[PDB]
Here is the input.
Amino acid sequence: KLGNSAIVTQECCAYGEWPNYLPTQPETATDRFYTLKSVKWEAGSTGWWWKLPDALNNIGMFGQNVQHHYLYRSGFLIHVQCNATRFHQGALLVVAIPEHQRGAHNTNTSPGFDDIMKGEEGGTFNHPYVLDDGTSLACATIFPHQWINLRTNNSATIVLPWMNAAPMDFPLRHNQWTLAIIPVVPLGTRTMSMVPITVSIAPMCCEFNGL
Amino acid sequence: KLGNSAIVTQECCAYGEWPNYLPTQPETATDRFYTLKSVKWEAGSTGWWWKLPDALNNIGMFGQNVQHHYLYRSGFLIHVQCNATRFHQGALLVVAIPEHQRGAHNTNTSPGFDDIMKGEEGGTFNHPYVLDDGTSLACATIFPHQWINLRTNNSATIVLPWMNAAPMDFPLRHNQWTLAIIPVVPLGTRTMSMVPITVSIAPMCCEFNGL
Amino acid sequence: KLGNSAIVTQECCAYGEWPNYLPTQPETATDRFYTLKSVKWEAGSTGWWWKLPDALNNIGMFGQNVQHHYLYRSGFLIHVQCNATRFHQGALLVVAIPEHQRGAHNTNTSPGFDDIMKGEEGGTFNHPYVLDDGTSLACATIFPHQWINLRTNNSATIVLPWMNAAPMDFPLRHNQWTLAIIPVVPLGTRTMSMVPITVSIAPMCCEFNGL
Amino acid sequence: GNISRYYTHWSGSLEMTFMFCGSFMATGKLILCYTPPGGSCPTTRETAMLGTHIVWDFGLQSSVTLIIPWISGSHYSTNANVGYVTCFMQTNLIVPSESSDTCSLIGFIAAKDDFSLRLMRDSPDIGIDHLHAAEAAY
Amino acid sequence: GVSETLVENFLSRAALVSKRSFEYKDDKNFFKWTINTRSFVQLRRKLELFTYLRFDAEITILTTVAVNGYMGLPNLTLQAMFVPTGALTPEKQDSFHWQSGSNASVFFKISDPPARMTIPFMCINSAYSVFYDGFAGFEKSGLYGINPADTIGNLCVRIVNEHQPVGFTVTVRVYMKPKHIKAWAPRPPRTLPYMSIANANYKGKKRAPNALNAIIGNRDSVKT
Here is the structure.
């Protein structure tokens, strides 16, 4: 439970690291679930990707601690929930890619500022089979990942530790992680369904230096 | 759990006799679930009957221990599972008839070899109300029986001890038991459904004498 | 004494290794003497060779454990008996050649499948003086060997341990040993005699992996 | 199978995991046969009972784990017969009138603790053409 | 090592990274090379299995010599000078910057064994960001994935001897070999062919294998 906004209930972690503080350390301002917009998962939906903390420069006391702090240091605690009934079938891969250097298809030109920086809007995979960077989705379970199989569960929980070689980073140009939700098995029902996928990001162990 | 083929999970018994060895005694060869074919239960399905161990002369290490052993001695542990959803209605009687001397309707001629010996194919009741032998289904709960009521459960489990006056028997001519599945309450849904009924037979306390 | 077939009575060993198990381990199925056909030793008989375990793919519970097991692991206990009277003279060398890479005479072409694989039929040396592979019979007592001198004895016994660099082997393509019986001193009597030579192979410490 | 293409001899128990991804009401059984190498690939479901196989009811379970045993790898560059994992229908697919009638499986594979790779060679996967920013590091 | 699957053993095979048959006669009289991971795609695909690395690269300059289509091969003196990510590179073959008292040259002859220096962990951060999801500097014009805390350095190599060296072409091979490798956060192996040495673009082959829509070569049916 994080912040005055009681949203979801957690205690799956990642990299064996529950976040601890390894100066401004927010614990009631930023440590709260910033629920994003719920994206409509249909039958022909390819994927979605949110680059953290680029998705949180806009929203909340974390967003004020980006515009008023030059260097940040934060781990995350993320929570994806896919509210579908007992007649929907489908499977998501909620994968959290560290340093997702995306690729541009078929050209020699690197991605620009308006292909990598989206923010709260998120984005969408174009070739999700190779994760938009030439690798493979079939091997993409080496990351911190979690399965939303709508037969079994409908929710996910990944913890994202501080993933930089640097001790602290500046937020408006670099993005550590990349939450990415790829429907492996596409959604099915006979009526032919816009099932929503709600993403709540909660920062953990925030530090901010340089007013 | 019997054999390298982990199939179903049990511990209902019958005749107060969990099988014990009262010479070749298979315990990893034959003691395993020989899953038969799943028969389609529809609305106009009368019944099904499998004469044991005539259904298992073909299949497996038990079938090699029939063709290479003159006398056998085995109890059984049987398991019927009827995989239907929460919209199917129906009720089976999984009855296990010892010495099911079947009858031929309307004639003075006894049943032949190709009316009693079927094997893996099984068979089907013609007049299930009298169990094809002039008795009655309404009194047929005096046998080892079990109810599959698709409202409540969908599985059954009967244990079949060694049922001979003789100490050991020869298998290619005599059949002790007769697993018989009679749908009392026939299957119902509005679409007008081929619900399958899967039968797994596992032998217990196998003995074989006479190579 | 091995198996239900009591054949011959033993306790000479070889390589200092009485077999022990260094998964399916037959001890009553395969551990038994598979008596082959008795070959007629005459005056002009050159030799006989049986590649083990190619001679036992056909015969017995070992033969079923070849066709139903991909990898085998077995030592042997072999027994040659040459039943001739007190008027026959002669001497056999019962030699057990590990890895008998045979040779084809006078040609550059390697032996095929139907010159190496015979099985229960056995085979016959063509140039027994060089053991069909260019070496020498005069030095062939470096193997596990045994002398049947019909003046003194008439029987032989060799124990064959597991002779592979590999831990387990596949049987239908490789043959470890090669029992070979070469009459050094040819058989003699004045009438001008088809003295038989009976070979009993008993496996020891059978292992079989891969159904 | 991308780390083991940087090597020559692999050996150890793999571990397959399948995961049914249909609706909550979808019932039926799948029989999952492991054919050991050199054996016969099953076609009839009844002759498929030869080695290790499991009847998997995906009405109850949603995921099964199928251990493949020791294989020992390239102990014989040459085409051959090295195992099969075979999955037949056992019953049928029983979905209700509202769920979609075309369900789906996905399958996973992980080596276990006894997996061992040795003798290192370069991967055959990568090669082909000229790259962009050629000689731009000079 | 204990196993051959250990990361110190998996990556520290010495790989060729540069090869410049530079022609010296009487800018083009020498070569430099930006030391980067992205040179040869056999090693590049192995370093891009990981996100963060920390390796002491050793550099083993092998210098050959060959006569063009005079019977003896002259034993020249060379200079492989490691310019880091700091001060200027020599603009000419005999400028002032070769005589720098801070760039650490080596002075090796051709007839010696191959020269060998060990460039240490050369970064600002605690690891090499192989993949960088950000932008350099401040502008929107900073290219994607180019971190200034990733360039190991430069390696300017010249022939120390004077001109009129006549048409014996000098082919210089340079072998990088990581040491003390500590590797963090592994990644999926790249399956599509490369486009540039700068970024992770993807095009695929025309048909499978290693294509965009099908990575494994197509069998006929699922029951094959």
In short: The longest strand of chain E covers residues 168-177. Residues 41-47 of chain E form the longest helix (7 residues).
